[PDB]
Design a protein around this ligand. Structure first.
Ligand code: AGS
Lengths: 139, 1302, 140
């Protein structure tokens, strides 16, 4: 397959290896493998992989010291954008929002709220899309 | 005249006119150089005998200090002058002597001093030059002279000599220049083209002769024509002579040719490029390359220039245009040009922008030829295009990772078999981790197929048979025996010889093995740094030398294999083979005792494995041996497994092993191993909550109890206590010293035994002692708690100093003597002043070192300190009457130097300082050896000698230069506030100028230099660092004045901005100073607006000149490839260490490049923790990265594999985290350094600086710290730094500073 | 004394967890075949390959010992390697050629080559052959 496909999975194998930097090289490689600068794919199966790769890139980014919180959010926003329907894209995004939320409160409950609502809304949409992350989402 | 004498009296008579073992060696080194090659061979036989005579004592000369022995260094020089003989036999005898020597670690070898490859350029324009004519005369000499012996050749040769006479008179300035001698005896008598190579051209010369007839018509110069007619007759007489004539003739041909004829000649050159006689064609292509080199010389004449001279340059450009660099590369693969081929490939890449993948296909082949350590992988990372899977398998082979993907090479074979050679690579995979059973399966598979390779695999099987050590396997080997032999296969034939009991017939075969080594020796002649490159081939020869000693016993110097190994370099790539050769020797031995003897060698290999990972291979090694069980040996295997992981599981296994080892009894090594197991258990105890620290301390205390003698157990315990101690207060502070004193006393006892980690640990111990002294004084000022309780601690501190005095050593002092300056600046006084007296005793041990520290002390007013230093001098004066006199002469000299340093185009010291020049001339001041920065650094004691090695060792050991003073008239540097440097003539006669600049905190920098060359020594210690061979230059600083320190400046040193300026001048591009002024930046400039203007201005300002700089830097293509390695060394890890330090913010002007070897230079890095960077503009970039500097860095690929390797070096660099921390503590500790910017406070600390120290610790962690939330990866930290270097955003943020268009 | 019975007991159990407990329980580490039994509980092919090699180095009197190395080759799952192991095995097993040939036939099923299938088909074994006999039905 021209798309990284299993090779994108191989980066996941690299994740089994546990070296993030090798994974980071893989993350650069995957975008090239679907296209030199592949968008989440027009084919639905390819798109699910493309979003998943973006999600893998986001998890890697969260691991990466060299990550921008706004940039990570933009990737998450893109992940919701590639499929409104997929539960998985929201679930990675919902998880991303929660990690963002603890930092966002910055020790103040009052400041938190509008951001929390957006995250809750994504969570609700995700719960409708699928229940697989829903039990974790429900707590 | 001197020679070894059969009769002693005749030698004695010669000796008396001429006028212990080391002196004999010095005579031997003179002996190794030979006036006559035949004389040298007799000397070589004597030298091999001398090494045998030295025996164990020769090993003792070899091992005494961690630093390589100077006498070994003479021996190392002997290796450089050793097996490099045109006679095969002469080279072989030298090689045999090297084998007795064995192989020094390349890192261990310290001989970077020799000029070696670097030399004044051979190339000259020629023909016009009298010397070029002399070269033509040389052509008449030698082979033309042999032609002269032939009568037909001689008549032409005599005519040629007459033609030379027509060019210049045989009689007379040219005659005086001429060597004459044998040449002088010759001189008195003197007084359509498919033809090239094919058909008529034949073996190069015949083709050249047809070309020469064409050439005379092409060039109209009257002088050229007269030379050409003479040249053709000579060319018929010698083909080789014709080739020498041809390069000059080609230069004439370029200067004049028919435009159509030149196009035909270019076409002919392309045809050879497109294309003994076959070798001659390859040589002819080389000759064409030589013509290209001649063209470069013509280009050099063009460089000297600035219509016909410009037109000739255009014609040369046309000749280059006819040439295709890509065509040259295709020829280069036939050439096996390698680095020279790469230089051509780089030029082609530079000439035309190219898609990387089109670039990549040439590059992958080029990498395979290169055998580069980055090799395929650097290219693969560079490639934006996914590699072909077969190419990826080749890349895996290029990685030589082994382990995983060995199957993957097999899997490509599984998908299809297209290459027997691919199958052969699979067979190496079949060998895998030395598995005999796999080989047995492989042999049957080899049998089913019919191939030449299967017999080669059988040779691999024979090596397996050597592992088998089975006579029946040898019988299987004999049917295999009789084939072309790989160097390993020849080693298998030698193993067949061991079964053979050939003896002298076997020895002739060993000589045949030596001849293969001689081919390695032919590879060995080369550019400087070649010996480290050839060391691995040399190591195979070293293994052969070890085999020869083993063979002599079989046919019937301690030569311990273990003793040899410590001296020998350990290589992940080659150490395992070296261990394997030792294992093969053990297999060869039939001795009865040896049934239990063989395994320890596998275990030592296992220790090598722990360093090399390959843990599965290491487990395999235990399988390879086994039996002869040692509880410690099993425990050590567990420890390597524990390092890989499962430490708790390993610890439980270790606990079982300890019960197995004993129902403590030292039992020789095993109790020490048990303590070592306990040390692993203590590390496990730090790892495990269930392990109890108080229990561990008793266990640690028990370990100290098990051996009083071992320093290492005590040191580990001392470190453990320090971890017990670091949180012992848990922020309680208050009482701490009585426990600390016990730890310090333990530290001193461990120091008295000495340790491999002892020098770093001792520096830490001294720092702790200094910390205690400061702490007691701080408690004293408060009056808090009990003054007596502090006094008891002071008495214990005094007791520790006395204990040091009983065990105190100048070698023991080492760093502390340098540290003492911080110690001198102490409020406490009393015992601390008494400790200073011990420092004074160290000063007594070496005067020059004491003087260098003192000179800095004198310049600071140090009025309490100045009195204290004088008191230390007075105590020394009391200790030696001679010492007091020497100190007084030294002080006057220092004062004289200081007056010169104040100095209140060529400034002459006699002309203004008439008295200062007179004093330098005067011997009345006591003679002083010149200060050496290398001399200042302490010598390092050998791990091998447990006791008195330090006492034997010089605190610093080197031949000592003595200053001869400086020339009365000398050039004086001109700069604003310019330091003026004059370099004193050496007693040998080498002279280094030193320049001192006022109001500079050199001493804080000098510690930073001390913070260096210790890490560099560590790099020498690292096997990977040695493989990198990334030597780090050390600045020499002598700031005796607090305001001014005079530093010698390396010849060819260039300011990076100045070198850049030179490149801009070479372009002839001009950027108006007014135009830069016209550009305006708001202090709050919009980042985007500033970046867009900067990028546009920079691109016009700096089209990269990096490619041009490399070509200018080395005339030789090979020199350029070595330079490329030098560029990779430049910055890189050395830049990374400074970034790791976080102190620097060096100006681009501060960065420097040295022309002879190309060296990145960092100087005057006053900022620490980027305090300067915080001031004004701040740049987070790890290293300055001008795009042209990057462009040189980009090379074939802009991303640098070397840069990634430098990061790898940096990860290796954070191995001694504690040692680095101690160095950091020292930097904070010194009074002269200020954390926050002399007489007034003779006896600066920043809490932020302490935080910065925490930041350096954070750097060791690799945690971002700055990043929100977030967990640190060392490879990642390097990648992030690389990303930072890539970003131009920091450059946009920076104002002025690097200020580089490129 | 319990351990010798236990090693037999672990085999009857055919349970890795029981085997692991026995290895911890034993005073003396298993070696050679005893080490090999430990390797099967360990489940790690690289350790097993090393163990098979070590056992072969001490002696090579067992076709089954060769078979365990072949099992390691199966763990490698490389067709070229499996063929290489098979060719070596056929020469080595003069007494029982093709005993591991059925294992090779499973490798042939991995090979998915009809000609590779034919060589196995040509081989005749009086064994159920597990999946590989089914593979022989698959072969036509
Ligand atoms: N051989 C050398 N090649 C290049 N730089 C050198 C050399 N020797 C010393 N330097 C450094 O470069 C300086 C040369 O003086 P200039 O740079 O012209 O002006 P300066 O103000 O005297 O010095 P700074 O502090 O470096 S700007 C010395 O002060 C050293 O810092």
């Amino acid at each position: 397959s021209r798309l990284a496909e299993l090779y994108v999975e191989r980066a996941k194998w690299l994740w089994s290896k546990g070296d993030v930097h090798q994974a980071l090289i893989v993350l650069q490689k995957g975008v090239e493998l679907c296209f030199p600068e592949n968008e989440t794919p027009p084919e639905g199966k390819n798109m699910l992989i493309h979003g998943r790769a973006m999600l893998l890139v986001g998890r890697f980014m969260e691991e990466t010291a060299n990550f921008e919180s706004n940039a990570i959010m933009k990737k998450y926003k893109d992940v919701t954008a590639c499929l409104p329907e997929w539960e998985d894209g929201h679930f990675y995004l919902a998880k991303y929002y929660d990690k963002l939320m603890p930092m966002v409160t910055d020790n103040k409950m009052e400041k938190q709220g509008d951001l929390i609502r957006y995250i809750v809304l994504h969570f609700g949409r995700s719960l409708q899309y699928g229940n697989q992350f829903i039990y974790q989402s429900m707590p | 005249f001197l020679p070894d004498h059969p009769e002693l009296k005749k030698i004695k008579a010669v000796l008396q006119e001429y006028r212990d073992l080391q002196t004999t060696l010095q005579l031997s080194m003179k002996a190794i150089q030979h006036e006559n090659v035949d004389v040298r061979i007799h000397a070589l036989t004597s030298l091999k005998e001398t090494l045998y005579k030295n025996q164990e004592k020769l090993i003792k000369y070899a091992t005494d200090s961690e630093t390589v022995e100077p006498i070994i260094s003479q021996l190392v020089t002997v290796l450089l002058k050793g097996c490099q003989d045109a006679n095969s036999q002469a080279r072989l005898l030298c090689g045999e002597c090297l084998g007795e020597l064995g192989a020094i670690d390349p890192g261990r070898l310290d001989f970077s001093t020799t000029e070696t490859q670097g030399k004044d350029f051979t190339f000259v324009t020629g023909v016009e030059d009298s010397s070029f004519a002399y070269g033509l005369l040389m052509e008449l000499t030698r082979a033309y002279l042999a032609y002269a012996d032939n009568s037909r050749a001689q008549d032409s040769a005599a005519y040629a000599i007459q033609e030379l006479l027509s060019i210049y008179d045989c009689r007379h300035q040219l005659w005086r220049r001429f060597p004459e001698h044998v040449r002088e005896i010759l001189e008195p008598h003197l007084n359509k083209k498919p033809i090239y190579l094919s058909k008529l051209g034949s073996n190069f010369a015949e083709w050249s002769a047809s070309w020469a007839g064409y050439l005379i018509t092409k060039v109209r110069h009257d002088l050229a024509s007269k030379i050409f007619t003479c040249c053709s007759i000579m060319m018929k007489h010698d083909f080789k002579v014709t080739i020498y004539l041809l390069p000059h003739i080609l230069v004439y041909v370029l200067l004049g040719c028919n435009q159509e004829d030149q196009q035909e000649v270019y076409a002919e050159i392309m045809a050879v490029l497109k294309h003994i006689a076959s070798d001659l064609c390859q040589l002819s292509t080389q000759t064409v390359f030589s013509m290209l080199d001649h063209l470069t010389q013509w280009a050099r004449h063009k460089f000297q220039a600035l219509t016909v001279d410009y037109e000739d340059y255009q014609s040369v450009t046309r000749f280059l245009d006819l040439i295709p660099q890509d065509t040259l590369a295709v020829a280069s693969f036939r050439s096996k040009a390698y680095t020279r081929a790469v230089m051509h490939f780089e030029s082609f890449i530079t000439e035309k922008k190219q898609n990387i993948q089109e670039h990549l296909g040439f590059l992958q082949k080029l990498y395979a030829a290169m055998h580069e350590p980055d090799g395929v992988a650097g290219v693969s990372a560079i490639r934006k295009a996914e590699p072909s899977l077969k190419e990826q398998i080749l890349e895996h082979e290029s990685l030589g990772l082994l382990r995983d993907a060995t199957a993957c090479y097999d899997r490509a074979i599984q998908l299809e078999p297209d290459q027997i050679i691919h199958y052969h690579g699979v067979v190496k995979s079949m060998l895998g981790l030395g598995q005999l059973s796999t080989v047995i399966t492989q042999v049957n598979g080899v049998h089913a197929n019919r191939s030449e390779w299967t017999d080669e695999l059988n040779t691999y099987r024979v090596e397996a048979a050597w592992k088998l050590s089975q006579w029946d396997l040898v019988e299987n080997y004999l049917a295999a025996d009789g084939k072309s032999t790989t160097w390993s296969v020849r080693l298998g034939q030698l193993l067949l010889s061991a079964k053979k009991r050939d003896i002298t017939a076997f020895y002739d075969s060993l000589k045949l093995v030596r001849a293969e080594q001689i081919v390695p020796l032919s590879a060995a002649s080369f550019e400087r740094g070649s010996y480290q490159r050839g060391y691995e081939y040399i190591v195979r020869l070293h293994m052969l030398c070890e085999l020869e000693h083993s063979i002599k016993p079989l046919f019937q110097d301690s030569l311990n294999w273990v003793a040899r190994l410590e001296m020998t370099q350990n290589s992940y790539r080659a150490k395992e083979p070296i261990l394997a050769l030792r294992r093969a020797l053990l297999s060869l031995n039939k001795r009865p005792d040896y049934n239990e003897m063989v395994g320890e060698c596998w275990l030592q290999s296992a220790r090598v494995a722990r360093k090399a990972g390959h843990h599965q291979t290491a487990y395999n090694a235990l399988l390879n041996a086994g039996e002869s069980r040692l509880a410690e040996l099993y425990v050590e295997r567990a420890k390597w497994l524990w390092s890989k992981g499962d430490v708790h599981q390993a610890l439980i296994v270790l606990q079982k092993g300890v019960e197995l080892c004993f129902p403590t009894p030292p039992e020789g090594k095993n109790m020490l191993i048990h303590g070592r197991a306990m040390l692993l258990v203590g590390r496990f105890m730090e790892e495990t909550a269930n392990f109890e620290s108080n229990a561990i301390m008793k266990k640690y205390k028990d370990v100290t109890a098990c051996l009083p003698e071992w320093e290492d157990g005590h040191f580990y315990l001392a470190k453990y206590y320090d971890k017990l101690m670091p949180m012992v207060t848990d922020n309680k502070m208050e009482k701490q010293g009585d426990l600390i004193r016990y730890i310090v006393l333990h530290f001193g006892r461990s120091l008295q035994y000495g340790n491999q980690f002892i020098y770093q640990s001792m520096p830490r111990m001294l720092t702790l002692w200094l910390d205690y002294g400061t702490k007691a004084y701080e408690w004293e000022k408060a009056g808090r708690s009990d003054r007596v309780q502090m006094r008891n601690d002071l008495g214990k501190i005094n007791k520790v100093i006395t204990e040091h005095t009983n065990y105190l050593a100048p070698y023991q002092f080492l760093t502390a003597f340098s540290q003492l300056i911080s110690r001198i600046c102490h409020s406490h006084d009393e015992v601390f002043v008494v400790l200073m007296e011990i420092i004074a005793k160290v000063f007594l041990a070496y005067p020059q070192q004491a003087m260098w520290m003192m000179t800095a002390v004198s310049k600071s007013s140090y009025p309490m300190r100045v009195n204290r230093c004088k008191e230390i001098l007075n105590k020394a004066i009391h200790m030696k009457k001679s010492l007091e006199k020497f100190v007084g002469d030294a002080t006057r000299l220092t004062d004289k130097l200081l007056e010169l340093c104040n100095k209140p185009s060529t400034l002459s010291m006699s002309t203004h300082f008439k008295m200062l020049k007179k004093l330098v001339e005067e011997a009345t001041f006591s003679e002083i050896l010149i200060p050496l920065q290398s001399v200042m650094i302490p010598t390092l004691p050998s791990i091998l000698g447990t006791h008195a090695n330090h006492a034997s060792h010089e605190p610093f050991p080197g031949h000592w230069a003595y200053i001869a003073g400086f020339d009365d008239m000398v050039e004086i540097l001109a700069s604003l506030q310019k330091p003026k440097k004059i370099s004193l003539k050496g007693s040998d006669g080498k002279f280094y100028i030193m320049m001192c600049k006022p109001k500079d905190d050199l001493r804080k920098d000098c510690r930073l230099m001390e913070f260096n060359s210790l890490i560099n020594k560590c790099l020498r210690k690292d096997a990977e660092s040695r493989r990198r061979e990334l030597h780090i230059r050390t600045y020499a600083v002598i700031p005796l004045n607090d305001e001014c320190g005079i530093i010698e400046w390396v010849n060819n040193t260039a300011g990076l901005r100045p070198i850049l300026t030179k490149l801009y001048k070479e372009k002839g591009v001009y950027m108006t100073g007014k135009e830069l002024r016209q550009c305006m930046l708001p202090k709050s400039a919009a980042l985007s607006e500033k970046l867009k203007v900067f990028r546009e201005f920079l691109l016009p300002r700096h089209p990269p000149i990096f490619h041009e700089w490399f070509l200018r830097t080395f005339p030789d293509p090979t020199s350029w490839y070595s330079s490329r390695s030098a560029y990779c060394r430049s910055t890189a890890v050395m830049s990374m260490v400074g970034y790791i330090l976080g102190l620097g913010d060096r100006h681009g002007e501060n960065i420097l490049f040295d022309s002879l070897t190309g060296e990145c230079v960092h100087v005057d890095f006053n900022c620490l923790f980027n305090k300067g960077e915080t001031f004004e503009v701040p740049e987070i970039v790890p290293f300055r990265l001008t795009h042209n500097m990057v462009n040189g860095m980009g090379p074939m690929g802009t991303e640098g594999l070397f840069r990634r390797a430098c990061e790898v070096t940096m990860r290796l660099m954070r191995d001694q985290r504690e040692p680095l921390m101690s160095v950091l503590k020292t930097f904070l500790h010194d009074p002269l350094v200020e954390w926050s910017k002399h007489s007034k406070a003779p006896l600066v600390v920043n809490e932020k600086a302490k935080t910065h120290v925490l930041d350096i610790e954070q750097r060791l962690q690799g945690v971002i710290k700055t990043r929100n939330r977030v967990p640190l990866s060392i490879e990642g930290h390097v990648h992030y730094l690389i990303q930072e270097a890539t970003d131009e955003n920091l450059l946009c943020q920076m104002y002025l500073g690097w200020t580089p268009y490129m």
